[PDB]
Amino acid sequence: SEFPDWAWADFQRPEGINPIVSPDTTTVFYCPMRQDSVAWESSDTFNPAATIYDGKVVVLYRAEDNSAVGIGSRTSRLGYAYSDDGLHFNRMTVPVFYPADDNQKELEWPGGCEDPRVAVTEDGLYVMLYTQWNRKQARLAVATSRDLQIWEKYGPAFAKAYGGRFFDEFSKSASIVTKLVDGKQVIAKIDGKYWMYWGEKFVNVATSTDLINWEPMLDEKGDFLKVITPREGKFDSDLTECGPPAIMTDKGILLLYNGKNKSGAEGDTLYTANSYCAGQALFDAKDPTKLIDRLDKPFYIPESDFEKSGQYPAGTVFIEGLVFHNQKWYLYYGCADSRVAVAVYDPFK
């Protein structure tokens, strides 16, 4: 045991496969906000969602356009990539999710729709948790679909909780609790509720009865319950940002997350300053707020050239998609905010 046996540490890069998604400067989209043609995935393709749809692995990748030059801020839209094996992908030439002239225009224009996480219910409802970015405030929002093409936007996930106290709260990166039912990964119901880990600067736990309206759990003082916080001198010393949906295992609820390392003595000098390395935490299956154990070293780190340097020069392995397909686990992640890559974990040797 290099890591505790509850951890899914053995994620390996499949040979000659990565990047699975790269920018395409030739594809075009008519943007309903810009009211003009946009090369919607021409600068960077990263931070992806992943789910199983009709026997295929579907990756919904965050794509940034060339609306500005270099440093200049761009719009995020989601591309659609599909695979039969989870390694080789085909792509749609238009985005499937983007800012539009809809009920969410004040919250999504001009930054767009970022960093999605998708999970599906037992009855086939795909639930997407993403960031709304209007360059003023980041908000965690909900969208649902049955085919991953036609999406219904419901707005911020914490809009109604405690009389609308957190509607203007800076939120993002949500990991819904899922479980395997007859080899199929579905949204899990614990104590008659739905559960999620969410956060960037710390991890909070939120619950729902309808998958649309989420309620952040609060302490005695009415402040967010922090079940995971950054740790000084560790790889997750700056940020503890939730990764893909959480998965219930025989040992408890497994949460795969992204740790940002602080620059200097406040971080872990063994890992690159300001880089994102992936970690894992184990929570109690009956009480998802109860932490059992956590990795003190990352299980996944930037190793390839496209992982170590890109739009984000300190590098990332920003884990955000996780699927169980043909008896293996496929982990989809952003590479230095520029590419999409996959790692494979075979739990059966």
Side-chain angles (χ1 to χ4, degrees), residues 2-220 222-289 291-349:
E2 189 179 57
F3 295 94
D5 67 295
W6 58 259
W8 296 3
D10 195 30
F11 281 101
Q12 302 297 324
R13 289 157 181 85
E15 299 72 20
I17 290 303
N18 294 317
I20 63 156
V21 187
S22 301
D24 193 330
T25 61
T26 69
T27 56
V28 63
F29 159 74
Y30 194 89
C31 177
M33 289 306 292
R34 291 291 178 186
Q35 288 182 358
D36 208 355
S37 298
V38 171
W40 65 275
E41 56 178 346
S42 59
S43 60
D44 296 289
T45 60
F46 53 117
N47 294 357
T51 200
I52 307 295
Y53 178 69
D54 192 31
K56 296 183 179 181
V57 179
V58 174
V59 162
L60 303 177
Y61 54 95
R62 177 186 170 178
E64 288 182 332
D65 56 17
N66 56 359
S67 48
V69 287
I71 292 303
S73 289
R74 300 165 188 266
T75 299
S76 294
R77 300 178 182 91
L78 307 183
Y80 184 113
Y82 54 101
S83 180
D84 293 318
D85 60 2
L87 304 176
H88 180 79
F89 283 81
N90 286 298
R91 291 153 66 178
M92 286 180 58
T93 56
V94 289
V96 292
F97 196 82
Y98 42 86
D101 190 20
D102 54 35
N103 59 327
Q104 303 304 317
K105 59 191 291 184
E106 290 298 293
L107 308 180
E108 295 177 358
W109 193 253
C113 309
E114 308 179 350
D115 300 352
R117 283 88 169 157
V118 173
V120 67
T121 71
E122 290 186 348
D123 294 320
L125 186 70
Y126 294 90
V127 179
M128 178 201 292
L129 292 156
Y130 67 101
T131 312
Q132 295 179 312
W133 180 230
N134 62 0
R135 300 188 185 158
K136 291 171 161 62
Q137 191 196 122
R139 296 176 174 90
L140 177 64
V142 185
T144 69
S145 183
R146 288 198 61 86
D147 59 19
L148 302 173
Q149 306 272 318
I150 312 302
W151 293 90
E152 233 285 282
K153 295 178 185 178
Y154 289 95
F158 313 134
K160 293 184 184 64
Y162 310 107
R165 180 186 165 185
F166 303 115
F167 183 86
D168 298 322
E169 190 70 26
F170 226 88
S171 59
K172 56 164 62 183
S173 309
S175 299
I176 286 183
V177 178
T178 67
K179 67 180 180 181
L180 294 183
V181 176
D182 298 316
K184 194 175 73 175
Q185 187 175 13
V186 294
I187 293 174
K189 207 163 189 174
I190 302 168
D191 206 353
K193 297 171 182 65
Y194 301 114
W195 296 77
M196 70 173 38
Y197 302 94
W198 72 276
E200 181 201 27
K201 271 79 180 185
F202 54 84
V203 178
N204 175 248
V205 175
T207 69
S208 186
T209 60
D210 58 22
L211 295 160
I212 300 309
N213 300 290
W214 293 85
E215 184 186 78
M217 292 182 65
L218 307 178
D219 64 19
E220 165 213 17
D223 302 318
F224 296 129
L225 181 68
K226 299 180 176 183
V227 298
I228 283 171
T229 59
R231 303 171 291 177
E232 189 174 26
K234 298 286 190 291
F235 73 100
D236 60 348
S237 44
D238 194 16
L239 301 173
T240 58
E241 194 167 9
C242 294
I247 181 72
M248 295 181 63
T249 75
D250 56 325
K251 304 295 186 173
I253 298 169
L254 183 60
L255 173 71
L256 280 68
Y257 67 94
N258 300 287
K260 184 186 171 179
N261 193 38
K262 272 191 185 170
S263 56
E266 290 198 286
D268 190 342
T269 190
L270 289 166
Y271 305 98
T272 298
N274 303 316
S275 71
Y276 287 72
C277 296
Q280 298 179 16
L282 190 73
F283 293 92
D284 182 81
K286 288 180 158 286
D287 182 2
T289 72
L291 184 66
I292 302 167
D293 198 16
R294 185 176 177 186
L295 301 186
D296 291 343
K297 283 184 152 59
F299 75 99
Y300 210 77
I301 70 164
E303 198 167 292
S304 301
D305 279 359
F306 50 95
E307 294 170 357
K308 291 182 171 181
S309 186
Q311 192 190 170
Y312 191 79
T316 76
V317 283
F318 196 87
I319 63 171
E320 193 172 316
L322 186 57
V323 301
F324 184 65
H325 187 76
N326 302 146
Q327 305 330 294
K328 294 181 181 178
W329 290 94
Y330 295 80
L331 186 65
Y332 299 88
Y333 58 96
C335 309
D337 289 354
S338 296
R339 303 296 180 269
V340 181
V342 62
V344 185
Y345 164 65
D346 185 353
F348 316 106
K349 266 281 174 295

